[PDB]
Every structure is written in structure tokens, then in C-alpha cells.
């Protein structure tokens, strides 16, 4: 009984860790009156700077590709986006609707500026970054050109956000 409840809490916390906007009821309100450093959060969807003429494509996703580089996998069902990088990088996921399980992707043909998941806290400003097999940004075979604009900021044991501008592919 009590052990079952404890296991339920542990599993719920682990599952909601990998969530854009987990629903956690709180007994009391939080104080965030200061208007600075409120943007570095896992629920901050979209990009820091967005143009009106940006191309966004919605696709079914497998796994949790939020704020990660995504690739196209063809299976019978329609092809789906999956967290991945390397030479198979098709785009980057910037939003997820969990009810419909639909991910919004900016294709690599477009340029993006925003916070993305980093491999670890070893990323500094003015650094060349590569998308790994898990769709995470790691310090430098850079098929694409991405530069870190800030340092890696830690929100959880594995949640690392870094402001990066991606502007296409190299040659």
C-alpha cells in the first residue's frame, strides 16, 4: 500500500520529467515578480525570435523529440519524426501537442534561433555544435552550421538548455 504509493510517486515524477508542460498541482503560489531570467524553462515553446514567414510542418512522432533534432523514419502507417541527428537530420522540433501526439518541426532549410537540448554542461559561447544520435547538441564532421549563443543552463539532472542559432548546412 504505502510502498505502492511511493512507487507511484517515483514513476509519475520520472514520466513527467520528460514532459513539456507537466501538470503538477501546488499547495501554494510561487513568486516570480522579477521580470528577468523567466525565459529559461522547459515549457518555453517556440523560438526566441520568430519571423512571420517561417515554415512549420506537423508530423506524428515516436518517443519524445521536444527541443531536439528530428529525422524522418518510414515504416502500415505514415512516416514519422524521431529524435535523431547526424546525416539523417530532417529538421528540429519546436513544439508538441501531446493530446494529438503531433510534433511541429522547422525544416533544416529554414533558420532558427532558440533554446535546444544540450548533451551536457560543457558548452560555451561561440562554439560549433553538432546534433548527436539522440538529437542533442554536443560540442564539436559538422554537416550543419550551428553556434551556441549562451552557456548551457541546467534545469534538471539531464535537462540542459542552450541558446543556439542554426542557419543551414555546411559544405
Amino acid at each position: 500500500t504505502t510502498q505502492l504509493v511511493k512507487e507511484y510517486q517515483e514513476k509519475r515524477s520520472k514520466l513527467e520529467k520528460f514532459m513539456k508542460n507537466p501538470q503538477h498541482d501546488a499547495s501554494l503560489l510561487s513568486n516570480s515578480n522579477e521580470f528577468r531570467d523567466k525565459n529559461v524553462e522547459f515549457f518555453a515553446s517556440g523560438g526566441t525570435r520568430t519571423s512571420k514567414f517561417d515554415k512549420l510542418e506537423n508530423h506524428p512522432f515516436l518517443g519524445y523529440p521536444y527541443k531536439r533534432g528530428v529525422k524522418r523514419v518510414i515504416q502500415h502507417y505514415e512516416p514519422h519524426v524521431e529524435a535523431g541527428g547526424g546525416e539523417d537530420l530532417y529538421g528540429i522540433c519546436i513544439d508538441i501537442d501531446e493530446f494529438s501526439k503531433t510534433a511541429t518541426i522547422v525544416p533544416i532549410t529554414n533558420n532558427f534561433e532558440g533554446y535546444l537540448v544540450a548533451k551536457d554542461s560543457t558548452v560555451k559561447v561561440k562554439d560549433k555544435l553538432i546534433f548527436n544520435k539522440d538529437g542533442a547538441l554536443e560540442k564539436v564532421k559538422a554537416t550543419i552550421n550551428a553556434t551556441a549563443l549562451t552557456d548551457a543552463k541546467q534545469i534538471s539532472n539531464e535537462v540542459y538548455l542552450v541558446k543556439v542559432a542554426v542557419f543551414g548546412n555546411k559544405a
Binding site: 506524428p60 502500415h76 502507417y77 505514415e78 514519422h80 493530446f99 494529438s100 501526439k101
Partner: protein, 313 residues
């Protein structure tokens, strides 16, 4: 609005030319009930009573009486919203493409807004009927490359916890074996006390042609269709049985009652195609319009749908 939105006026004028969906014939008038939303989930609660013990005789003085308990079950139904985009000619540019016999650019396949909307709505209604019948969304005749849908979104052909029978490949032409499988499924049907209700069967054209054969040495003055009707009447308490043919089905027979208490279709009031206010406009004569439609809303009770699949391998 109609003095400002020519597209809205054209949709209002052309909406009457669209034909009614064929899915309406598959359900009774009382089985369909419109709801009010576009995307999300709805919850339905069903209450049922039961007796906890034998009743007590009221003799002399007594205060200890038997009890009647209650229980409830909750069912969640998920809906989805989908959109399509189609190109058409601008109203001000129509006059420069009008001809004596037609209006539009034949060489580039460009149509007036009303005609394009009518054709797109017809295609979307066909797709919606296919979704209602089969529980899948696809544009391929092979049936592959299906659009992944939400859970709790099922059709008549893919509804879980229903009776499913499989006629073997070697006996695909054996109507006696097919009827044996149908009888087994009918016996496995569980309608409870609502068994005294009309029944509905949907068959493919090939199965219909097989049915219209004389009932088997051979006999006359009786058909396999009549035999099937009598067999279904043996379980529906001599109630009406209706048979329909659908080109969407392939070597499959669907049997289900027409009782709202067992199967109910509660679709969104925006399920049928609806024009969108957003109209893309450029410096050229080509414009783009959008049509929205909502999918989902079929509720059924457990083990009340019989699905006979005749393996054609």
C-alpha cells in the same frame, strides 16, 4: 457579411448541391445525436442498479430490509480536427476566364470557387464515410500508408471487444462454410435483454452476388439471403433485418443491431465539411481556401458487433 465575403456567399449558395452522406443509412434516426465541440474528449456516464439480497417479507414489525446497490461506468471518446487546402480562381479574375460553355482555365486546371468547393466537399464526404465505416483514414486503394489516429477512435470494422470470424481461403467460395461461420458468430453475439431490436448487415458486392444465389443437391423458391435473414431473426426475437451493400468493404460482412442503447453515434456538429475564413490572396489570380472537418464519436457495447472476414488468399 454576405455583402463583404463573396466566398461565404458562394458557399451559402452552393451548399445545397452537396449530397447527403451514405453513412446515414447505416444507423437509425434515434442512434445519432450531435454534440458541440471541435477537438478534445468527452465523457459518458452510465448508471446501473443491482440487488444485494433477496427481498424481505413485510410481516408484523421489521426494520432490517434488503438493499439495492448502484454502480457507474465512464467512457471517454476522443475527437480530431482535420483540414484540406484547395486552389481556385479569384472572383475578380473569373470574368477573364469565363467562356461560352464553361468558366475556368482548362490548360492549368483552375476552377471557380463554388465548383472547387463542391468537388472538394464531395471528396471529403467520401473520405468521412470511409472513416465511419472502416475506422481508418487512407487515400490508397491498397489501404496502406494510413494516417495515425488517436486512441478511443474506432469504427465499425475495427471496434475492439467484438466477435470476429475468419472464413478460410479454401472455403472462400463455399457459402455453406460462410454461413457456418456466420451462425457461430451469431451464437457468440451477446445482446442481453435488448435483443428484441432490428438488425443491420453490411456486405460487399461480391458477397451480395453470392447471397442472391438460390439456396442449396439444390432447391428453389428460397435464397441464401432469406436463409441469413431467418438465421438473424432466430436471435433478434423475430425483429426486422436489413441488408445493405457498400463498395468500401472487401470480403467482409458486418452485423450489428440498430438499438441506441447498444451502439450510438454522437459526432461533432462540425463533422461535415466547413469552409474556413482564411483565404490566401496574392498579386496573381490564384487563391487558396481551406475546409475543416471533425472525425470521431462512435460508441458501442462489448460483444455486439459481428465481423466475418473471408480470406481471399
Amino acid at each position: 457579411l454576405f455583402d463583404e465575403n463573396y466566398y461565404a456567399k458562394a458557399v451559402a449558395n452552393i451548399i445545397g448541391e452537396v449530397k447527403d452522406p451514405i453513412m446515414y443509412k447505416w444507423f437509425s434516426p434515434d442512434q445519432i445525436e450531435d454534440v458541440d465541440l471541435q477537438m478534445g474528449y468527452q465523457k459518458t456516464v452510465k448508471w446501473d442498479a443491482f440487488l444485494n439480497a433477496n427481498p424481505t417479507t413485510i410481516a408484523n414489525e421489521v426494520n432490517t430490509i434488503s438493499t439495492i446497490g448502484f454502480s457507474s461506468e465512464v467512457v471517454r471518446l476522443n475527437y480530431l480536427k482535420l483540414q484540406y487546402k484547395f486552389r481556385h480562381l479569384k472572383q475578380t479574375s473569373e470574368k477573364f476566364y469565363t467562356s461560352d460553355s464553361y468558366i475556368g482555365d482548362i490548360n492549368n486546371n483552375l476552377l471557380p470557387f463554388a465548383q472547387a468547393y463542391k468537388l472538394a466537399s464531395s471528396e471529403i464526404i467520401k473520405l468521412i464515410n470511409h472513416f465511419v465505416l472502416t475506422g481508418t483514414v487512407s487515400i490508397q486503394k491498397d489501404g496502406k500508408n494510413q494516417k495515425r489516429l488517436l486512441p478511443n477512435m474506432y469504427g465499425l470494422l475495427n471496434m475492439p471487444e467484438q466477435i470476429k470470424e475468419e472464413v478460410a481461403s479454401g472455403d472462400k467460395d463455399k457459402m455453406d462454410k460462410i454461413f457456418e461461420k456466420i451462425e457461430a458468430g451469431l451464437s457468440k453475439l451477446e445482446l442481453g435483454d435488448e435483443f428484441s431490436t432490428p438488425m443491420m448487415v453490411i456486405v460487399d458486392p461480391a458477397t451480395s452476388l453470392k447471397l442472391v444465389k438460390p439456396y442449396a443437391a439444390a432447391s428453389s423458391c428460397e435464397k441464401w439471403e432469406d436463409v441469413l435473414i431467418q438465421t438473424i431473426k432466430a436471435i433478434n426475437n423475430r425483429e426486422d433485418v436489413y441488408i445493405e451493400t457498400s463498395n468500401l468493404l472487401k470480403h467482409k460482412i458486418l452485423i450489428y443491431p440498430l438499438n441506441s442503447e447498444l451502439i450510438k453515434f454522437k459526432p461533432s456538429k462540425y463533422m461535415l465539411p466547413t469552409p474556413n475564413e482564411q483565404v490566401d490572396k496574392d498579386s496573381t489570380d490564384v487563391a487558396h481556401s481551406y475546409i475543416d472537418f471533425v472525425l470521431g464519436g462512435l460508441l458501442a457495447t462489448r460483444k455486439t458487433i459481428l465481423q466475418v472476414n473471408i480470406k481471399q488468399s
